[PDB]
A paper describes a structure:
Polycomb repressive complex 2 (PRC2) is an essential component of the epigenetic machinery, regulating gene repression primarily through methylation of histone H3K27, which leads to changes in chromatin structure and thus exerts influence on key biological processes such as embryonic development. The minimal core PRC2 complex is composed of three protein components: the catalytic subunit EZH2 (Enhancer of zeste homolog 2), the WD40 domain comprising EED (embryonic ectoderm development), and the VEFS domain comprising SUZ12 (suppressor of zeste 12). EED contains seven WD40 repeats and adopts a canonic β-propeller architecture with the ‘top’ portion for H3K27me3 binding and its ‘bottom’ portion anchored to the N-terminal helix of EZH2. The recognition of H3K27me3 by EED and the resulting increase of the methylase activity are believed to be crucial for the cellular function of PRC2 in propagating the repressive marks at the chromatin loci.
To elucidate the binding modes of EED396, EED666, EED709, EED162 and EED210, we determined the crystal structure of EED in complex with each respective compound at high resolution. The crystal structures were solved using a EED-EZH2 peptide (40–68) complex, except for EED396, which was determined using apo-EED. Each compound in the structure is well defined in both unbiased Fo-Fc and refined 2Fo-Fc electron density maps The EZH2 peptide-bound EED structure is highly similar to the apo-EED structure with root mean-square deviation (RMSD) of 0.58 Å of 317 pairs of Cα atoms between the two structures. As illustrated by the biochemical results, all five compounds do indeed bind directly in the H3K27me3 pocket. As an exception, the benzodioxole moiety of EED396 engages in an edge-to-face interaction with the Arg367 side-chain. For instance, the dioxolane of EED396 makes a unique contact with Arg367 in the deep pocket. While the central rings of EED666, EED162 and EED396 form π-π stacking interactions with the side-chains of Phe97, Tyr365 and Tyr148, those of EED709 and EED210 are involved in cation- π and Van der Waals contacts. However, they exhibit significant induced conformational changes for residues Trp364 and Tyr365 (with a movement of the respective side-chain of more than 5Å), moderate changes for residues Arg367, Glu238, and Met256, and minor changes to residues Phe97 and Tyr148. Together, these changes result in the formation of a much deeper pocket as compared to the original aromatic cage found when H3K27me3 peptide is bound.
Author numbering: 66 to 104, 111 to 280, 289 to 440
The structure:
Amino acid sequence: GILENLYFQGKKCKYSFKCVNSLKEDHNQPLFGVQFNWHLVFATVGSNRVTLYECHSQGEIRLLQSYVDADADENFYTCAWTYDSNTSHPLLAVAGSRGIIRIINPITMQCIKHYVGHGNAINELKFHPRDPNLLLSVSKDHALRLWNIQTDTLVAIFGGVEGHRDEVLSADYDLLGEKIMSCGMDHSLKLWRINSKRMMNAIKESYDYFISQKIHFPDFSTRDIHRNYVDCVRWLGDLILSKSCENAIVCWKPGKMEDDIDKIKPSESNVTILGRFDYSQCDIWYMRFSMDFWQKMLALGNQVGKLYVWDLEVEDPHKAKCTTLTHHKCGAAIRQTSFSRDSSILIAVCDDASIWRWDRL
Ligand SMILES: COc1cc(-c2cc3n(c(=N)c2C#N)CCc2cc4c(cc2-3)OCO4)ccc1OC(C)C
Ligand SMILES: [Pr+3]
C-alpha cells in the first residue's frame, strides 16, 4: 500500500502535452474525423474533402495533397487506413452522407474504387486488425456491413430482427478481430461474433469470388449502460469503453464480474460497470474519443475546445489520472482526436475547420 504509492509517486512524470501548432482549413466547415496511419502522416475529413498531412520537426504541420469529391454536396464523416495485402502500399477508405465508400490511394490522393450498400449515410469505417482486406461500415440504415476490398464483395449485413433499431454510429473490432461491438441511436450496444462457423465460411467464400450473409441476431445486447444514444465505442482488451451525452465514458463488460467474454451467451442479462471517466461540456451528439495504438492513453475533446487525456495504466480510482489541455484560440467543438503510432503526437480537429497539434513532452 504505502510502498506501492511511494513507487508510483517517486517515478511519476504525468502525461504532459504542449500545443506546438494549429491550422485552419479554407472551407470553414466542421472537420469530423482525423486518423494517423498506424500501418507521421494523418488524414482529415470534413465537407467533401479528404486532406493528407505530415508531421515534422519544430511542430510543423505540412499539407501534402487533398482529395476533393466531384459532388460538392458530399460530407465525409469518417476515414480509416489499411494497406494492400500484396504491395504493402497504404490505402485510405472514406465515407459519409452519400453512403459511398471510396478507396483512396493516399500517394496520389485518387479514388481507385468505390462501394455502395443501400446508399444511406455511413457514420464510421473500421478495418479488421488482422485482415487488411476486411472493412466494416456502420450506417444510418441501422445495419453494419462487412466488405472484402480484395474481391469487392459484401461479406455480411449485421442487422434485422434483433439488429439495431436506429442509426448505428460507431463500432470497433477487438484485438484479434474475432468480435465487433457496435452502438447507436437506439441506445444499445451489441456484440457480433465474426469467428462463428457461419462468418468464417462467409469470409472464406468471399475470398473464392455474391450472396451476402444477413446476420439478424447479435451474440450479446444491452441498453443498461447508457440512458441515451451511444455515439462512440471501443474495445479495451476484454473490456469496453463507450459514451453517450452524459459527460462520462463508461468502462464495462458483458456478464457478471467473473464471466469470461468467450462464454457469454446471447441471453446474458447482466453487465458489469467497472467505472467512468468524467468530463464536462460534451453533451452534443457525435463527439468521438480515441486511444493510442498501445491503449495506454484515452483522449476526448469537448464542445468548447478543451481536450481531456486519461492515463489508462492507473488502476487506482483515487490517483491522478486526467490531464486537461486548453488553448485560448481553441474554442470550437473538438469532434475527434488521433494519436501517432509512437504516441508522442495528439491531433485534435474542430467544428471551425481548425487542426491542433499537441506534442507529448
Ligand atoms: C450535412 O451537414 C452536416 C452534418 C452533420 C452530421 C455529422 C455527423 N453525423 C451526422 N449524421 C450529421 C448529420 N446530419 C453522423 C456521423 C458523425 C460522426 C462524427 C462526427 C459528426 C458526424 O463528429 C465526430 O464523429 C453535422 C453538421 C452538418 O452541417 C453543417 C456543416 C452545416
Ligand atoms: Pr499501474
